Design a protein around this ligand. Structure first.
Ligand SMILES: C[C@@H]1[C@H]([C@H](C(=O)O)[C@@H](C)O)N=C(C(=O)O)[C@H]1S[C@@H]1CN[C@H](C(=O)N(C)C)C1
Ligand SMILES: [Zn+2]
Ligand SMILES: [Zn+2]
Length: 228
């Protein structure tokens, strides 16, 4: 891994990196959150911010130094602080941001800054192609309510990488994390829907653990089964 300031960057694939920021919270110590950086021709795409604006500014600083390509857009995967805490750094830099319309509607209640554009989804969970233009390899899929009602997921076309955000925990997790905003009744089906939407993704990236195999999907579903 490459440490840059207080953030960590790990190359996952020729054009894909995972960014990691930490937030020190009393009683738990530093808590990592993961997002994605994707190079696509002559532009860069970002999945999720860091915990804060200052940390999210360091993501763009690392991009300028290590990739040196303009950041075309960013997608944030729900209105929990580890995913949208740094929206201002993106907007300050002039970067177009996209989120589930539900996430932008929930944002002020969550103390988050809403994205500048809203994504809507068909009944099968796939993004309406009109609302996700020029996304390149970013394939956005809404699995259904799980970790939150608005949580979305992103597969990376041309790779074996799919990003489950906070919906998916790794195979060695012993809880489903924060269920304060969770839909305990549809969580398991939402997790399996993510698995079905990207059936051939072998590397599963998630918010709060190192990249896992597809076991993380199945494991997460079966811990969510015990909540019904
Ligand atoms: C604090 C997280 C964060 C919160 C959330 O997304 O609900 C919010 C603060 O942004 N996402 C969360 C999640 O469950 O996905 C919660 S708890 C998370 C899971 N256990 C992780 C942990 O204890 N680590 C040491 C990594 C923290
Ligand atoms: Zn969350
Ligand atoms: Zn989280």
């Amino acid at each position: 891994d490459q440490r840059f300031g207080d953030l960590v960057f790990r190359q996952l694939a020729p054009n894909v990196w995972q960014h990691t920021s930490y937030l020190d919270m009393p009683g738990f110590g530093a808590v990592a959150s993961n997002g994605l950086i994707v190079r696509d021709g002559g532009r860069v795409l970002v999945v999720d911010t860091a915990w804060t604006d200052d940390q999210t500014a360091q993501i763009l600083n690392w991009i300028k130094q290590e990739i040196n390509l303009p950041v075309a857009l960013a997608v944030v995967t729900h209105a929990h602080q580890d995913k949208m805490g740094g929206m201002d750094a993106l907007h300050a830099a002039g970067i177009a941001t996209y989120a589930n319309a539900l996430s932008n509607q929930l944002a002020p209640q969550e103390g988050m800054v809403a994205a500048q554009h809203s994504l809507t989804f068909a009944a099968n969970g796939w993004v309406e192609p009109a609302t996700a233009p020029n996304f390149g390899p970013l394939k956005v899929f809404y699995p259904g309510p799980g970790h939150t009602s608005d949580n979305i997921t992103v597969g990376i076309d041309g790779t074996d990488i799919a990003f489950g955000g906070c919906l998916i925990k790794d195979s060695k997790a012993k809880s489903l994390g924060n269920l304060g905003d969770a839909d305990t009744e549809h969580y398991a089906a939402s997790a399996r829907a993510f698995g079905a939407a990207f059936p051939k993704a072998s590397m599963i990236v998630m918010s709060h653990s190192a990249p896992d195999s597809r076991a993380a999907i199945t494991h997460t579903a079966r811990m969510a089964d015990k909540l019904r």
